[PDB]
Design a protein around this ligand. Structure first.
Ligand SMILES: Nc1ncnc2c1ncn2[C@@H]1O[C@H](COP(=O)(O)OP(=O)(O)OP(=O)(O)O)[C@@H](O)[C@H]1O
Ligand SMILES: Nc1ncnc2c1ncn2[C@@H]1O[C@H](COP(=O)(O)OP(=O)(O)OP(=O)(O)O)[C@@H](O)[C@H]1O
Ligand SMILES: [Mg+2]
Ligand SMILES: [Mg+2]
Ligand SMILES: [Zn+2]
Ligand SMILES: [Zn+2]
Lengths: 439, 439
């Protein structure tokens, strides 16, 4: 049912006019309008594309044929074309039907006159079937895909795929709508306000919210409880944003002290730098595949990114290296740092090539066809990148030398306790002990 | 039939005169002429090729066998050639007939030394059947392909496919004729002038104008209207040129302020810049996947582009980031500007590599085989491009320095009054008040 697709109102509409166009044509086809020959659905993974298609097949009332985009090419030459001829043959052999081909990437790759062969023999047959010499009517076709630009230009033409519909990640309102829908059919308690969960999950799809509610319910029943409450939703939310924790893996005191100084370094570097994102939990329990992680959670779920925020992030990604390099001396820096060091490099490149934030290079886009530029401009670009990185390192140590006391105090805070909230990090920096258990 | 194909009157003339040959040969077989042995049809997607094939099949008054390039080549070896032999056996058997192999991209592939010994058997049979040893007369063949150069050289050889006919995207008058044709099924109002819309859609094929009319009609019938009128055509044309409207979005006032300053920058750089394309409406309502777009629009749809107009395009691309720099200081530049830069760089390269508009590079075409020139001239070229872009952005920055008052005036005129129009933009840039409510 179309009510099961909460959020993405435009896409649900733009299939819903097709459905109610089928149910009573004369309310729409009076002035000469007629059925659209095809809807395309594009967007990231896990947003509601296949869901919307299953809802259209549920509320339409006409015969609905579905196939993946990979059930065509078995191992000979000309087997896919035969299966499209028989697919549309069965399709037009009855009333106005709908034909949902899912994963349209697998037969939608654009044909390029360099090696075109038996490979593109299925696509040409689909093209001749959608809009060919013999004009049939009544057949609608719906196809989904993660990759709109890989598709041919002869598929995305009007007359074959009349309208294009993009289903992407929801915002806070639609997000709270999705949670309100999945908080049904679970024995909630009071205390549960889905707007609160929606404010704290920037950048989650529908599949991840629904998974949140599900494993929160299972965790509720496994504690022998009676109703689901904000502690459970908070737990599962942490299991999605950070990773499953592990209260095992016995390890020495020198190691856990070292990690305490590493994550202490990221935290202090991220809490006193103008432009950094707001802070979140900062543990040393090995959760996920990492040995402790300082997570940051935005609130206004931005789409763009300024320059000060890029430099602030670029400084957060080195507080561990500079931290343990200021405590344990220089010849004792380990090799774990390199991992997060990796990510810093990526940011710096986007600041120079794509986004255009270096005055020495210019306001030019060296990003795509990086291999077409000469060697001088790439020398200047890469030199600019490295200058950004080491400048950020210098800022980081200049700051961690004047915040030494908060560094040690917070290190002991992470070594006595295992985790810390945000304001718990603040008070542990100030020095007032927290109301909880020293593990 | 041939009156249904509005625009591309040359191809229409060729096929009209072929069918006119099949009507009364004596007007043409006096001086000894004989029919063309073949007509090929090339052009981009959606420009009316299969349509002309339908017209000639409908009016030729003789048999008309049609197939696709993919209805050959099933599992076993030598079945495609077999089907071609039987196709021309039926063709010879029936009458003076016509044969339409739609989508010749499949079987008309280029021959090369590295084909796997069985790919080009169908093609070779098609060649020994068209102008082989046992010559005959009475069979005409028509073919359609998007990729004329991707065809073998023995299919295009006169004797086989005498006439190479070139369907192409219409000009202004052609679009007027297409719209006037397709509006004959729409219950129209009296405020409809297709010349306006034809002047509004510079670059659309015939199919896109078709479903433009269709969606305008269907939208007219959603609003409980009585006749499709000009505002509806405006709605649908805007939908196709920019995308859906996406009414339901939560927008912090700082966000939509910053956006209004970005498109304010583009609009001013396109307003007072010599040679820039005349300005159409500039909105900040979140259309499609962009958060606001200023949309320029030409007048006389020329194909050439002078050097003045090119530099105008570069400046129009730099105006946005220059706006954010002038208002929010330099550190507060976002990453949305990347989508601007990526376009401008493109134009810059066309000014230097292929259009021949530089002084140090020369009057030479460095475009084709870019990877084959030396490393010195590519250094010179890329230095030239970088200089073009830098000079562009500095011109933009002092232009927006002189027009600061109008910049704030139009930014505030966009935070209020969503989606101004060009005339309305000029009224806002002086201080008038618009004859319409605020949102
Ligand atoms: N708007 C929504 N309302 C309710 N549930 C949603 C919504 N959007 C997504 N979901 C959840 O997402 C799941 C289906 O995801 P979907 O199949 O749409 O992803 P997808 O677009 O197919 O991704 P991929 O193309 O990578 O498979 C459902 O189980 C559903 O619970
Ligand atoms: N010149 C025209 N006059 C009227 N209608 C047109 C014209 N050109 C295209 N159309 C519309 O386009 C449709 C068919 O387009 P056509 O099949 O010619 O594209 P095509 O040449 O096959 O492109 P492709 O080969 O990429 O599919 C028709 O249904 C018709 O409504
Ligand atoms: Mg799916
Ligand atoms: Mg065609
Ligand atoms: Zn780290
Ligand atoms: Zn822009």
């Amino acid at each position: 049912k179309f009510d099961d697709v909460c959020g993405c109102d435009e896409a649900r509409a733009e299939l819903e006019e097709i459905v109610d166009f089928l149910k009573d044509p004369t309310k729409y086809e009076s002035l000469g309008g007629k059925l659209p020959k095809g809807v395309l659905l594009t967007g990231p993974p896990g947003t509601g594309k296949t869901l919307l298609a299953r809802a259209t097949a549920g509320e339409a009332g006409v015969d609905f044929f579905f196939m993946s985009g990979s059930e065509f090419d078995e191992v000979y030459v000309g087997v896919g074309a035969k299966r499209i001829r028989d697919l549309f043959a069965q399709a037009r052999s009855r009333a106005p039907a709908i034909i949902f081909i899912d994963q349209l990437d697998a037969i939608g790759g654009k044909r390029n006159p360099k090696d075109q062969a038996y490979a593109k023999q299925t696509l040409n047959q689909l093209l001749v079937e959608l809009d060919g010499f013999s004009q049939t009517s009544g057949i609608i076709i719906i196809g989904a895909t993660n990759f709109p630009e890989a598709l041919d230009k002869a598929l995305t033409r009007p007359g074959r795929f009349d309208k294009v519909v993009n289903v992407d990640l929801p915002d806070v309102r639609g997000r709270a709508d999705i949670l309100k829908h999945h908080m049904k059919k679970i024995t909630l308690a009071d205390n549960v306000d889905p707007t609160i969960i929606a404010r704290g999950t920037p950048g989650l799809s529908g599949a991840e919210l629904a998974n949140l509610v599900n494993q929160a319910a299972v965790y509720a029943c496994q504690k022998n409880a009676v109703s689901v409450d904000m502690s459970h939703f908070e737990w599962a939310k942490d299991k999605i944003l950070m990773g499953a924790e592990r209260k095992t893996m016995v390890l020495t005191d020198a190691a856990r002290k070292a990690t305490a100084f590493h994550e202490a370094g990221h935290a202090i570097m991220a809490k006193y730098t103008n432009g950094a994102t707001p802070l979140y939990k900062a543990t040393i329990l090995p959760r996920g595949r990492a040995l402790g992680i300082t997570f940051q959670l935005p609130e206004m779920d931005k789409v763009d990114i300024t320059k000060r925020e890029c430099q602030a992030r670029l400084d957060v990604c080195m507080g561990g290296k500079i931290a343990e390099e200021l405590i344990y001396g220089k010849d004792n820096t380990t090799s774990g740092c390199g991992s997060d060091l990796q990510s810093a490099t990526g940011t710096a490149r986007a600041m120079v090539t794509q986004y255009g934030m270096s005055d020495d290079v210019g306001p030019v886009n060296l990003s795509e066809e990086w291999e077409s530029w000469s060697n001088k401009i790439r020398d200047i670009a890469d030199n600019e990148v490295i200058e950004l990185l080491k400048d950020s390192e210098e800022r980081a140590r200049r700051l961690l030398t004047k915040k030494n006391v908060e560094l040690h105090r917070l290190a002991q805070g992470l070594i006595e306790y295992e985790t810390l909230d945000a304001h718990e990090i603040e008070q542990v920096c100030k020095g007032e002990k927290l109301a909880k258990l020293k593990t």
